[PDB]
Amino acid sequence: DSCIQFTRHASDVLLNLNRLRSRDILTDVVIVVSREQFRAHKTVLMACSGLFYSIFTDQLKCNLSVINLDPEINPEGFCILLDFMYTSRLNLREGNIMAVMATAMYLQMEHVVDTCRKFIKASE
Amino acid sequence: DSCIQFTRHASDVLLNLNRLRSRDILTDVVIVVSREQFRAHKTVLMACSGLFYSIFTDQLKCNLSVINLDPEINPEGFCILLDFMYTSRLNLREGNIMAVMATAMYLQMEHVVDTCRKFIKASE
């Protein structure tokens, strides 16, 4: 086509989606990770995670307001990944890299899994 | 912070949101523009438009499944803008620039209004 493109549009959209998350506006699901709860937008979770995409395209699960993750999932690892989903920034640290990679594998977040594997390989 | 960033994340998120729109997955509102109807995600509309942000943060309007736009709004201009919201690409043409700018002013999409004013100024 003969379209023009606004370079910053996708980033500005994500920034606004994160502002809605921060103010709890139009969040439509709670993700339960053991004793912790995380409110989010189903569409954003689906756009970032193969696992949430599969869950919310399911004809029954699409209507659930609460999703319980596997008890092996670490709440901090999930929190770091949820922040990444809404900002493109990943808080990857020596103390959290194992929990973050395990959570990203479960959530099916391929690019996060890739950078975790590379950062681990560099330290061995 | 000491975060790393995935350059393409925001773009990939928007691409996935557009895939959900194309398959009518988790769309939660119909925008009526005269005889035409457009299905969309309230969060995406809010992230792109000052008008939709104001509408869906209203304690009553936030719960509406149908929003009727002003009858002066052109369905094609709205369609072009809805596509822009979900892709960052704007199909700006000599034949549609006036309808697109008028729709972007109503929807409060400042960057679109700016490029329309510049393209019009170049042709005068």
Partner: peptide, 4 residues
């Protein structure tokens, strides 16, 4: 704005 750019030509994509």
């Amino acid at each position: 704005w750019v030509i994509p």
